[PDB]
A paper describes a structure:
Kinesin-1 (also known as conventional kinesin) is an essential ATP-driven molecular motor of the kinesin superfamily capable of processive movement as stepping dimers toward the (+)-end of polarized microtubules (MTs). Kif5 contains a N-terminal motor domain (also known as the head) that generates force and processive stepping via Mg2+-dependent ATP hydrolysis and exchange, multiple coiled-coil (CC) regions with breaks (stalk) that mediate dimerization, and an unstructured C-terminus (tail) involved in autoinhibition. To limit wasteful ATP hydrolysis and futile runs, cargo-less Kif5 adopts a compacted autoinhibited conformation that involves an interaction between the motor domain and the unstructured C-terminal tail centered on its IAK (isoleucine-alanine-lysine) SLiM31 (hereafter just IAK motif). Using engineered stalkless chimeric constructs of human Kif5, we present here MT-bound cryo-EM structures that explain key aspects of kinesin-1’s mechanochemical cycle and autoinhibition.
To explore this using cryo-EM, we designed a stalkless ‘bonsai’ kinesin-1 chimera, dubbed Kif5bMoNeIAK (Motor-Neck-IAK motif), which fuses the N-terminus of human [name] (motor domain up to the end of CC1) to its C-terminal IAK motif via a flexible linker. Irrespective of the nucleotide state, they were present either in a two-headed state with motors zipped by the autoinhibitory tail or in a one-headed state with some tail density still visible associated with the MT-bound motor. Whilst for ADP-Kif5bMoNeIAK only the IAK tripeptide (KPI in the opposite direction) could be modeled, for AMPPNP-Kif5bMoNeIAK the ordered region is longer (AQIAKP or AKPIRP). To assess the structural impact of the tail on the ADP-bound conformation, we superimposed the one-headed ADP-bound Kif5bMoNeIAK model onto ADP-bound Kif5bMoNeXXX. The models are almost identical in all regions (RMSD = 0.3 Å), demonstrating that tail association has little effect on the ADP-bound structure of the MT-bound head. Despite the presence of the tail, the MT-bound head of Kif5bMoNeIAK adopts the same apo-like ADP-bound and Mg2+-less conformation seen in Kif5bMoNeXXX, with an extended helix α4 and ordered loop 11 in the MT-binding subdomain and an unfurled partially disordered loop 9. Furthermore, the bonding network between loop 9’s R190, β7’s D231 and helix α2a’s K91 described for Kif5bMoNeXXX is also present in the MT-associated head of one- and two-headed states of Kif5bMoNeIAK. In contrast, in the presence of ADP, the MT-associated head of Kif5bMoNeIAK clearly exhibited a disordered (and undocked) neck linker and shortened helix α6 in both single- and two-headed states. As the two-headed class had lower occupancy in the presence of ADP compared to AMPPNP, it is likely that the stabilization of a docked neck linker and CC1 supports a two-headed complex including a more ordered tail.
Residue numbers in the entry:
A (entry chain K): 8 to 194, 199 to 323
B (entry chain B): 1 to 44, 47 to 360, 369 to 436
C (entry chain A): 1 to 37, 47 to 437
The structure:
Amino acid sequence: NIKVMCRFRPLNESEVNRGDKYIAKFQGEDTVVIASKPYAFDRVFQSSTSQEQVYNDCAKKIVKDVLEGYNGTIFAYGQTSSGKTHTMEGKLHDPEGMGIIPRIVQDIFNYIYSMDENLEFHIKVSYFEIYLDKIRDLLDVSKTNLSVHEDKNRVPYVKGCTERFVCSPDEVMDTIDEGKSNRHVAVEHSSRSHSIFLINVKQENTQTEQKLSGKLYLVDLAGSEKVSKTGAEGAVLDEAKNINKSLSALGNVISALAEGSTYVPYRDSKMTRILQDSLGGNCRTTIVICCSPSSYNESETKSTLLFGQRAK
Amino acid sequence: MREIVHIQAGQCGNQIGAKFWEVISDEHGIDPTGSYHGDSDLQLERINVYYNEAAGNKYVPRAILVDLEPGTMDSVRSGPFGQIFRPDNFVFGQSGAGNNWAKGHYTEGAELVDSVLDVVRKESESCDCLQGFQLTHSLGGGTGSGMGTLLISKIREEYPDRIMNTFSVVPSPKVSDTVVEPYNATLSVHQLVENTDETYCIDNEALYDICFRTLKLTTPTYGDLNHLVSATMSGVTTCLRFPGQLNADLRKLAVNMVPFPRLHFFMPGFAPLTSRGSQQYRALTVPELTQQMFDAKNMMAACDPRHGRYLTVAAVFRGRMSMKEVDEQMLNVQNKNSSYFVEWIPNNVKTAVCDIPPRGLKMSATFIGNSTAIQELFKRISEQFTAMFRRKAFLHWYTGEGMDEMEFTEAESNMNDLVSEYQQYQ
Amino acid sequence: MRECISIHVGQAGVQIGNACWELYCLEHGIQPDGQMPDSFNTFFSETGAGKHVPRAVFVDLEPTVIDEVRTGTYRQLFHPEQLITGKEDAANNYARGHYTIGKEIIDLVLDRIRKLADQCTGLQGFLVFHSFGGGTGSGFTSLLMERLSVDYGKKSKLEFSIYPAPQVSTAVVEPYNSILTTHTTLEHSDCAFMVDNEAIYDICRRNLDIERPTYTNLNRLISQIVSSITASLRFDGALNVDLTEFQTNLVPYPRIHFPLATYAPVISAEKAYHEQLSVAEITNACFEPANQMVKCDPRHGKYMACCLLYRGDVVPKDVNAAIATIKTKRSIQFVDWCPTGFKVGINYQPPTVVPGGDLAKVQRAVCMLSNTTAIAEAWARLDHKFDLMYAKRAFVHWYVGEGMEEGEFSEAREDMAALEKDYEEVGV
Ligand SMILES: CC(=O)O[C@H]1C(=O)[C@@]2(C)[C@H]([C@H](OC(=O)c3ccccc3)[C@]3(O)C[C@H](OC(=O)[C@H](O)[C@@H](NC(=O)c4ccccc4)c4ccccc4)C(C)=C1C3(C)C)[C@]1(OC(C)=O)CO[C@@H]1C[C@@H]2O
Ligand SMILES: Nc1nc2c(ncn2[C@@H]2O[C@H](COP(=O)(O)OP(=O)(O)OP(=O)(O)O)[C@@H](O)[C@H]2O)c(=O)[nH]1
Ligand SMILES: Nc1nc2c(ncn2[C@@H]2O[C@H](COP(=O)(O)OP(=O)(O)O)[C@@H](O)[C@H]2O)c(=O)[nH]1
Ligand SMILES: Nc1ncnc2c1ncn2[C@@H]1O[C@H](COP(=O)(O)OP(=O)(O)O)[C@@H](O)[C@H]1O
Ligand SMILES: [Mg+2]
């Protein structure tokens, strides 16, 4: 089923001296009210919540399902300086402040270290991004216009995407860094393109001769931008248009899945087309949206909350 | 100022385009030699939409003709209006397509697409402000389908924010001339559903039926069918070159008529249509045109509108008429036939009125409909494709040019998804 | 001196302006070439050789109708730099008229407006004509209004808009554009007048005895209303009322500034005779529910303030008698907190008849501008249409494809709900 999680960040030192004020109000643990307008979700986190609680409550079940041959997907949507990188990556080695991806790889590797000796595991990693509705490869700059096809079982995939094996969390972190070192970033560190990261785990029992394949998807959604209030010209305007259209299409797909409609518009955009296997049916997906409670950022916070609410 | 680049691919496309250019030149008052011999200023006021200026008061069409055989080229060049095209815009090969989608789209079309794109680019850089591209082709053939699809893909890559409308002739159930038509139709729809902004579906069976019943023709030929198609094509974009009380652009029609990105398949129409020796007994007013347009025996697609509901209907009137009459007619049409229109969309009908009627008419109207009845056409095509694909019949010709069965499977899945989309809102 | 600036944006605005300027030229005796063979300074300015130039700006993103103006019978009247034209129209898209195509001629129109305002000493306000539903008339009007509010600020701005009809309609995406533009018009305007085509069609059918009306008749009627409003500034007479007095007598609370207009007597030549057409008869006919130019019967609501603008041969004693007769009635209900809700204005200049027109030469005419609580029904109908179309999110990808987010629709819907709530709560 579809689950939406909302996280709030504290007022840092660099902005407390300007006299900003809180806007968010909490009731229980699932309702956050701004300007006397409720916004119900599945779980709302407060400032004091550490990363361990977020990992245990948002991603643990999805990680568990992958290791049994199922599929999972984790999104990430928010504006700049809203907590996205802190809740996704953070410090890469601190055992208390590390993000979600380090805990994901730690859990996915601590199981391979403890399961008998008659099972053989392989790990595959891919890293491709969507920019101007054209799939590029972050792990191979040579490829720039990859395509999407369907195999015999009409399960979509990406053709020609680079796929390399790994053997330890260090390799996964290093390839993550190398992939991120080529993503489109505007002039503080605002991403202008959606990013998709695949962690494929497949097992084959040597005795039982049964094969199980599992896919985990990590998606970094770019931020929607209101063009009228900025003054975008040239390439920035095209990027904003593409980002808004893609986010609207993804919201439409998620709403259609949630409402139980007979037809789901899976073929309206590239991103929903690729994730067609790991979105509906017996697939568990969770969305994390990061918000800022300062009065300086009320409009973007409202937009993020509305995008989260669109799913339902 | 809102120019249009015209491309014709294949024999059917070339002949339809020749008839279309004859009709347009008659409307604007241009002699076959390329001179101007009109009688009004409005003819020359917006002539840059379809024509280019030349030395000594001469006008050359912005048309590009592409084919893999030199037969249609020198058949057109010898016609009544063959002296009008620019000789450098003819591009052709020597080896025919042979009714092979794979050949035209992969082997012999890839050795000719560069020159066609070069002439397209040269033609499109002399325009002040582009509006879109027009393409005329047939889905059931080899050169037309594959070549037009390749050109569409290349142009959509080069120009990603321009209108693309194609007037494609669709295979008919009870009229056929090729044995491998369903393969071509499916492989062409698989790309038209993705790389087009609004496509107009036409079939020969409906045109033959119109000629037999409404026009009371005895021995119709291809000229009449091409003539009807050209008439509706000219009526589609009449607001880009003439004044009027209400003006509708191509992008305006796309915005008003397309609710969701995939559903952009329309069935055209025209009115009035009568027979010689039967015009003195009919009065010509707005109600008569409205009644004729919404008739099941006037559409140019072999689909029954009664077996479904409309999503959006666009009616472009030409002539002098009152706006209250048009509004009341378009309202009572929906009120009387509430079961034939989608309930959750209010005001399914859009009205555009221009005050320059076609020569020899007092009033004319073109009908553009987006109904769910178009699903049965794809149903028949997919059924024939499934019948001929289980046994892999006539398949080694396509796999002999560099294709795979996965292309056929993906095309069939895409067409099935389109059919599922259209049925959902019924 | 007392001057006003007219801005016509969109096709409907341009055609309304054509009718209005024909009427003004007829009234003040100015030929189409600008030569006449001090009651005209309000709408024109001299040049030193006898030519008169209107204080108007024509703006459209499509070159069709403006080109009709440049080659028509009034080609020698307008300054060629006033008629401003772009390349591609909005295609019924709010975002295209707002930003995507708007940021290509907005500086030009702002410079022209500044040039016209720098040449006028006693500016009174602005007069904007546009239509709801279209891309240009809903998006480009918002940008221009915002820029004018930032720049000028304290100057009054009056709007004359076309509202979507209940059943008769032309486009399919009209509710979206109307909702967005009515969200925009509450923050920057000062007195917005709305009309719909269906009521005017009915008025033409019953009164004028014409069965196939077109846009020209509607434009002529709207031009007559505007001329009746501006006659007080232009001409002289007993009890003259200007714009600020209108606003201080008509708008009780800051956001309740949405009146509906009515004109009388709209009669034909055949019925011009055989009828008395005294002051009392004309005054009574203006309160009928079948003569309003908006599809809403005033019986299901209460009036707050109405201003009567008589022009022609009128004596105040007759006005007072007619007012007493109207007050003694029962079907017309006023609010309890307004013991006096009538503002009377009289002018000595009778209405002018345009050649080739459907109206008759009458010795007197009235124009009543009243704001009642019965104006929320049209808003309710349009909001119901909007939510019915927005539940499935149809035609939305076109709007988000120009950089417009999905929160604007909900915000505008909330604003319209708040406006309707305010009207209902102030009615009681
Ligand atoms: C005496 C009189 O009024 O004659 C009419 C006529 O009888 C009818 C039957 C015409 C006639 O049309 C046909 O018979 C016909 C033949 C082949 C294909 C399609 C139609 C007519 O030939 C066609 C002709 O159409 C035009 O003149 C339009 O401008 C039309 N022109 C052409 O198609 C055209 C033909 C040859 C050379 C150049 C142009 C047009 C329509 C749409 C957009 C542009 C142009 C008209 C009104 C007539 C005749 C002459 C009998 C009809 O057709 C049209 C297109 O108007 C058939 O039903 C209509 C109703 C007309 O009343
Ligand atoms: N009174 C009157 N109304 C008109 C006229 N033309 C259009 N309308 C109304 O205006 C609405 C359509 O908007 P338009 O003004 O034509 O569109 P636009 O403002 O030019 O915007 P775009 O054409 O989309 O760029 C409909 O409700 C029409 O009924 C006219 O000439 N007179
Ligand atoms: N209206 C019309 N249809 C045609 C004409 N010629 C062929 N067709 C149709 O086009 C289809 C055949 O494709 P065709 O264009 O001849 O093959 P190609 O030359 O390889 O593109 C069949 O459905 C024919 O009925 C023509 O001149 N006019
Ligand atoms: N939940 C949180 N609790 C405490 N501090 C946070 C939290 N989220 C973000 N921060 C602080 O915000 C700072 C920068 O945020 P960052 O993740 O870089 O946002 P972005 O990547 O969008 O710029 C970090 O130094 C971190 O200390
Ligand atoms: Mg327009």
